Amino acid sequence: FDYKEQLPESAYMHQLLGLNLLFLLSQNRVAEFHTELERLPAKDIQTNVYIKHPVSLEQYLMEGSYNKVFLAKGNIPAESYTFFIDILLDTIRDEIAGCIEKAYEKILFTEATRILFFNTPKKMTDYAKKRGWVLGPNNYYSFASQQTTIPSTELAKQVIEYARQLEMIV
Amino acid sequence: TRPANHRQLTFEEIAKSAKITVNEVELLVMKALSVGLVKGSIDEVDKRVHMTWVQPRVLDLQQIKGMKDRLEFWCTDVKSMEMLVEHQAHDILT
Amino acid sequence: LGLPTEAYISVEEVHDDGTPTSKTFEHVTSEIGAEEAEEVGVEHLLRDIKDTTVGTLSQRITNQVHGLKGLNSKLLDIRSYLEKVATGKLPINHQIIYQLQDVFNLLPDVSLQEFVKAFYLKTNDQMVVV
Numbered sequence: 358f359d360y361k362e363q364l365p366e367s368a369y370m371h372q373l374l375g376l377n378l379l380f381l382l383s384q385n386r387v388a389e390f391h392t393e394l395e396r397l398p399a400k401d402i403q404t405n406v407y408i409k410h411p412v413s414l415e416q417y418l419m420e421g422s423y424n425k426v427f428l429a430k431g432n433i434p435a436e437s438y439t440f441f442i443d444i445l446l447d448t449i450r451d452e453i454a455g456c457i458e459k460a461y462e463k464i465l466f467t468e469a470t471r472i473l474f475f476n477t478p479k480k481m482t483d484y485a486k487k488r489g490w491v492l493g494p495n496n497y498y499s500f501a502s503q504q505t506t507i508p509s510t511e512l513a514k515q516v517i518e519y520a521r522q523l524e525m526i527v
Numbered sequence: 528t529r530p531a532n533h534r535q536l537t538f539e540e541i542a543k544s545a546k547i548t549v550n551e552v553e554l555l556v557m558k559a560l561s562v563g564l565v566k567g568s569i570d571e572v573d574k575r576v577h578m579t580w581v582q583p584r585v586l587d588l589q590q591i592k593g594m595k596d597r598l599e600f601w602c603t604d605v606k607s608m609e610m611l612v613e614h615q616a617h618d619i620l621t
Numbered sequence: 622l623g624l625p626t627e628a629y630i631s632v633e634e635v636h637d638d639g640t641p642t643s644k645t646f647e648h649v650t651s652e653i654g655a656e657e658a659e660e661v662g663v664e665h666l667l668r669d670i671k672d673t674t675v676g677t678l679s680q681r682i683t684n685q686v687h688g689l690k691g692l693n694s695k696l697l698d699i700r701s702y703l704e705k706v707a708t709g710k711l712p713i714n715h716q717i718i719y720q721l722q723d724v725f726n727l728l729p730d731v732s733l734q735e736f737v738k739a740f741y742l743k744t745n746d747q748m749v750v751v
Contacts (some may be wrong), residue, residue, distance in 0.1 A: 507737055510611065512744070517615050517682070519751065524619045524679050531728045580726055583719045585638075588707055594721060595703040602696045609689040612682075619679040620686060621672075 358396060371407040376437055378411040382418070383444035385452070390415060406434045414445070423449060427474065450474070450484065458490050458503045466498035529578075530597075536576040549574070622694055626651045638715060 374397070381390040394402065394412065401408050410432065417425045426449060430442060453473055457464060464472065466481075475481040485492050491501035529536070538549045547555060556576050559565045566580035586594075613620070629646035636642055655663060664671075673680065699721065705711045730736070 505734065505737060506732060507740055510608075513608075513612065514615060517612065520678050520682060521616065521619055524677075530725075531730050532732060534730075581722075583722045583726070585715050586718055586722070588709075588713075591703055591713070591718065592707045594725065595700060595707055597725070598696060598700040598703060602693065602700060605689065605693050605696060609686070609693055612689065613686050616682050616686070620683045621677075621679050 371401070371405050372435055372437060375405075375407040375411045375434075376441070378408065379414070379438055379441045379445070382411060382415050383441040383448060385448050387415070387419075410434055410438070418449065418452075423453065454484060454488055457500070458488075461500060462502055463500040464498060465496055469498045469500075534578050536578055538571070538574040538576070541576070552576075622691055624651060624653055626653065 378390060378393060381387075381393065397408065402412055403409065410429070414426060414429055417423075417429070427446075433439075433442070450473060457472070469475075470478060470481050473484065476483055485498070490503055492498060494501055538552045541547075541552045541555065542549045545555075553569065553571060556565075556569055560567070564582040565578050567576065567578040569576050628649040628651040630649050631644060632647045633642065633644045702711070702717070703721075706713055731740075
């Protein structure tokens with residue numbers, strides 16, 4: 358992006374650039390992701406494939422079409438886009454979790470396996486052996502939902518503050 | 528014995544105490560209130576008794592020590608709020 | 622913290638609890654009040670170091686702080702007496718124990734919901750006026 362006038366156009370550039378975008382998505386750095394997209398020129402977002410694919414993955418992931426995100430696995434412009442697809446699957450699982458523990462009531466074992474695209478059923482225990490949302494009640498996958506006293510001290514602080522700014526001379 | 532925080536007495540609690548099945552705990556609390564020993568009310572839809580008072584009696588040394596401990600805790604609370612207010616209003620105390 | 626006058630009156634009577642009777646004093650409530658002919662004098666003598674007979678917010682906050690001072694002092698006195706009674710250096714006074722357990726009886730509850738609701742409601746009204 359810097360020595361633009363002097364540097365000759367490098368056709369062997371978009372590959373690494375989009376691979377960087379994929380890396381940002383992989384480590385859930387959405388802010389930096391969109392900053393670099395903005396840095397990129399406008400046309401490349403819709404013309405090139407190397408960049409379009411990471412753009413497509415991020416767009417799908419923000420919409421919530423995780424099924425499309427997964428189905429995109431086979432669709433990869435160049436094999437270089439590797440190991441970040443894997444870190445991206447891991448991060449997607451983490452985000453699916455985030456959803457589950459922020460806003461659900463309880464997910465049974467079969468439905469947890471269905472929703473979270475875990476590893477083989479035997480390792481399906483994964484992410485409960487790792488995150489462990491206080492699981493266990495009734496069925497081991499009860500999800501243990503992770504969902505009134507006057508704050509007298511704080512109210513006293515604030516009211517005293519009113520009095521202080523009203524009585525001080527200024 | 529019970530402090531005011533949870534002085535709500537349940538009928539099952541009374542029954543497990545002095546041995547009467549829970550259909551005359553109402554009459555027991557009735558007579559208790561009538562004699563002037565305990566003031567309050569009976570809310571039997573949810574089966575509870577709100578005792579707001581008790582006939583003060585003569586206690587033992589152990590019970591007086593219990594009261595002393597409770598006074599200690601109360602004093603700690605009072606001093607804490609005292610210090611907080613005096614520290615946060617230092618400029619407007621005449 | 623307190624008034625300078627404490628008043629007593631002599632009472633000899635057969636104690637209800639059957640403890641041996643002796644001629645001892647009993648407290649009588651005391652206050653300080655003045656005729657107008659003496660208010661005209663006290664006011665003049667104290668005009669130099671007087672406190673405004675109106676609630677300046679600073680004075681009212683001072684009054685509340687002093688109230689907390691006094692409550693702490695009284696609670697310390699009660700605790701010291703109870704400690705002496707428990708350890709035995711003093712005999713038990715049934716009148717004092719009666720009054721203390723009545724105080725505890727009268728302690729209020731704040732965690733109760735239909736009081737927190739009311740407190741929030743009126744706090745909000747007061748702060749709309751503010």
